[PDB]
Structures are given as C-alpha cells and as structure tokens.
Ligand binder design. Structure first.
Ligand code: VO4
Length: 276
C-alpha cells in the first residue's frame, strides 16, 4: 500500500498533532508486529557466541544473519533497501574481539561503504570499539586496513580506507556521523538528510551491501535505513510507505528503529526532503 506524497504530506499533520500520539500509536503497532513469528536466533544465543554480542538482548535473526565463509557467526543481518534485496548489512559496533570477524565480513561481503552513526564514547559510556587505524595501517586477521585520508564536516566525517586480504585491494569509505545527540535524535533533520544523501550516493553499482552500524546496530541504524529507502522510493515513484516498510525490515533484524522519537524523526527528515 504505497501512498502518494500529496496525501503523505497532507495528512501527517494529524500524526504530529496532539503531542504526537498518532505516531506513538503507529509505532506501538510496530512494537507488536514481530511478536508471533517465532523468528529464530539460536546462533546469537548459543553460549559460545555470547561474548560476540555487544548486548545480550540484541540478536541476529537466523534467516538473515550474515555468515562469514569457512566461527561463522557475526551479530549482523542483511536488510532490504527499496527494490534492492539485501541492500544493507545492519550491524552493531564491533568489539575488540570481533574486529577480525568484522573486517572479514567486509572483505567477503564485498562492501564498499560503511555508515557509522555513533561516537566511540558517548556521555562517559563506551558505544563502539575503535575498529580502524587511527593513522597508518593496522592488521585484523588477514586484512590490513590502511587510512588514506580523513575529511571532517560539521556533522559527519569521511575516512577513506584501503584494505587488503593477505591471502587484492579495495577502497572502502566510511561516513561517520558525529553530532548525534547524547539523548534522543538530532534537532534538525537537515544535516542527517545531507549525510544520508552523500553516503547513499557513494554506492558504486556492482558492490555488496552497505554496512550500517551504531552501538546496538538497531536504533539509529534502523532510522538510517528507512530514511534512505523512503527517499529513493520518493525520487523514483513519488510515494512512501514508512509504516509498511518498517514492519518488513523488522523481520530482518530486531528493533530496527528502536524509538518513537526516532520514528517521528524519519518523518521530519522525509518531509523536510519533500519540501527542500
Ligand atoms: O546504538 V543503537 O542500535 O541502540 O541507536
């Protein structure tokens, strides 16, 4: 049930009205929507991958999890884009003990772009281990990753890496969003629009899923995926279905778009885009 923009914009005023309870109501239904699908995640919970999960309750569904080739586990899922099956790999901030697994999946999965939407440390709390070399090279299993350049913008930074399996070379590019608030979401959807735009557009045409991560890899990660998917749907079709696309991707990884303030925020972003 795609709807045209006209009626999207025409009626969303409703959802924003009343302290936002409309959104709040659509989002609960979203909370309820995977409840009875007994969607398996036994690789996540298997006792000897326990320490590979940054958070004990944030898991990888079995059916869409990313398997490292032949100890094949990694807390990461394929998630669909807008007419691209498996457009993204949603993943948590890697840990010291998962850096190898993390770059191996990048190598193997052929991914060219990396979207990072957390700071390493936020408000005194650790969110993501530094999995890339701060300058020069560092080695993680069989992949040498090397920092070739850095560019810092107001709300995000671009690190261009060059990586190599030590058993061939690839330029990987990380877009790292750096001004996501301590609590909630940004105050202005604009800088996130521009971030989504440029990072989305760096996707070269014969490459693997774009890896997206934050801390748990669900919240801001999910919010990134809907904005960007809903934006392409709009260029191409002039329609949207934020609700029905959310319920589809929530079967591909748990809690995508963790909050209602984030859900709300997809909409500021999209509306701002439609009127920009
Ligand atoms: O770092 V999160 O996937 O809880 O937004």
């Amino acid at each position: 049930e795609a709807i045209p923009v006209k009626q999207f914009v025409k009626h969303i005023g409703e959802l924003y009205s009343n302290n936002q309870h409309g959104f709040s109501e659509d989002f609960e239904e979203v909370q309820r929507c995977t409840a009875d699908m007994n969607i398996t995640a036994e690789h996540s919970n298997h006792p000897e991958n326990k320490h590979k999960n940054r958070y004990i309750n944030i898991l990888a569904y079995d059916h869409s999890r990313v398997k490292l080739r032949p100890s094949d586990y990694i807390n990461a899922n394929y998630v669909d884009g807008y007419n691209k099956a498996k457009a993204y790999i949603a993943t948590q901030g890697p840990l010291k003990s998962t850096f190898e697994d993390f770059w191996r999946m990048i190598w193997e999965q052929n991914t060219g772009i990396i979207v990072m939407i957390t700071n390493l440390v936020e408000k005194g709390r650790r969110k993501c281990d530094q999995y890339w070399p701060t300058e020069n090279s560092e080695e993680y299993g069989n992949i040498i990753v090397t920092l070739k350049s850095t560019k810092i913008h107001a709300c995000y930074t671009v690190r261009r890496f060059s990586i190599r399996n030590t058993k061939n070379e690839r330029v990987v590019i990380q877009y790292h969003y750096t001004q996501w608030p301590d609590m909630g979401v940004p105050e202005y959807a604009l800088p996130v629009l521009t971030f989504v735009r440029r990072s989305s557009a760096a996707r070269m045409p014969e490459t693997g899923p774009v890896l997206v991560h934050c801390s748990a890899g669900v919240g801001r990660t999910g919010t990134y995926i809907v904005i960007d998917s809903m934006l392409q749907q709009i260029k191409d079709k002039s329609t949207v279905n934020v609700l029905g696309f959310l319920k589809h991707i929530r079967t591909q990884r748990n809690y995508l778009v963790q909050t209602e303030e984030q859900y709300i925020f997809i909409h500021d972003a999209l509306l701002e885009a439609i009127l920009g």
